Write a protein that binds this ligand. Structure first.
Ligand SMILES: C[C@H]1CN=C(Nc2ccc(F)cc2)S1
Length: 284
């Protein structure tokens, strides 16, 4: 059923809450035993948000291989994403270790360091050229190279150096800075513009490791980003673009990380983004 029509039918009937609860009821349930080990307590921002054992990212260290991160592998769309929580005080070094080991080109950040008067993430990138960061626990150095600040998002060029081997890589930091403290944006125009800038960079392309995407928990805004990308890619690839069922794509993605899309407002915003984005993907 054409999603634009399904959209007006849910809107006119005001059944967004009822659709959203059907998804929660049908969503996969897999074990998260490694996340709940006592040694990993301070590696988790939220007690109710864990990666599944089958899909979790492992750090390449014999000590403790655990990070709150999941590999979302979309077989038909031919896209992979890593979804992770905002780094914590004692996991900032683990975060950059994962970026290095998985050969990611881009980091996508959908939250501000402070929201609603509380800390949502650590300040994990350097804010000045001449003041670099050193992660002694993972033996990595990080340097700000340049910064381009626009109205709805900032792009930063960073250099990450493996102090063990002295290899260096360029990482792009895509920071969406205007998601509101409560609810969702009114229009998806600036979110879609942001997604096309990430795509244009080659950060989402198969010649690199998967893109690292995060908000505070790594399931809400993070969910919205990868659901919209995958849905628009599938509308490009298939003979019948109207066959693309956004609830089916979400349930497939929820086999890899729990809780993707946190509210009925976020589900509705996901529909709007795809519906609007398709008016470029279908030839405009
Ligand atoms: C000065 C940089 C190099 N090493 C660092 N560690 C750190 C990690 C998290 C945090 F919240 C505060 C500090 S930051």
């Amino acid at each position: 059923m054409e999603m634009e029509k399904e959209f007006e039918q849910i809107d006119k009937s005001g059944s967004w809450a009822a659709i959203y609860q059907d998804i929660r009821h049908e969503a996969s349930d897999f074990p998260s035993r490694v996340a709940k080990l006592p040694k990993n307590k301070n590696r988790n921002r939220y007690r109710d948000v864990s990666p599944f054992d089958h899909s979790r990212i492992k750090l390449h260290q014999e000590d403790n291989d655990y990070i709150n991160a999941s590999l979302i592998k979309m077989e038909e769309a031919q896209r992979s994403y890593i979804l992770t929580q905002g780094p914590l005080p004692n996991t900032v070094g683990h975060f950059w270790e994962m970026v290095w080991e998985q050969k990611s080109r881009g980091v996508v950040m959908l939250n501000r360091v402070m929201e609603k008067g509380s800390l949502k993430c650590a300040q994990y990138w350097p804010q000045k050229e001449e003041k670099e960061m050193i992660f002694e626990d993972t033996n990595l150095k990080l340097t700000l190279i340049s910064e381009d600040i626009k109205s709805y998002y900032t792009v930063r060029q960073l250099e990450l150096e493996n102090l063990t081997t002295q290899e260096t890589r360029e990482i792009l930091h895509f920071h969406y800075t205007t998601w509101p403290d409560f609810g969702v944006p009114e229009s998806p125009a600036s979110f879609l513009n942001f997604l096309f800038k990430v795509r244009e960079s080659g950060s989402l392309s198969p010649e690199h490791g998967p893109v690292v995407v995060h908000c505070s928990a790594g399931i809400g805004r993070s969910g919205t980003f990868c659901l919209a990308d995958t849905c628009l890619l599938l509308m490009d690839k298939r003979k019948d673009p109207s066959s693309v069922d956004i609830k089916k794509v979400l349930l497939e993605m929820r086999k890899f990380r729990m809780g993707l899309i946190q509210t009925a407002d976020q589900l509705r915003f996901s529909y709007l983004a795809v519906i609007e984005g398709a008016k470029f993907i279908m030839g405009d």
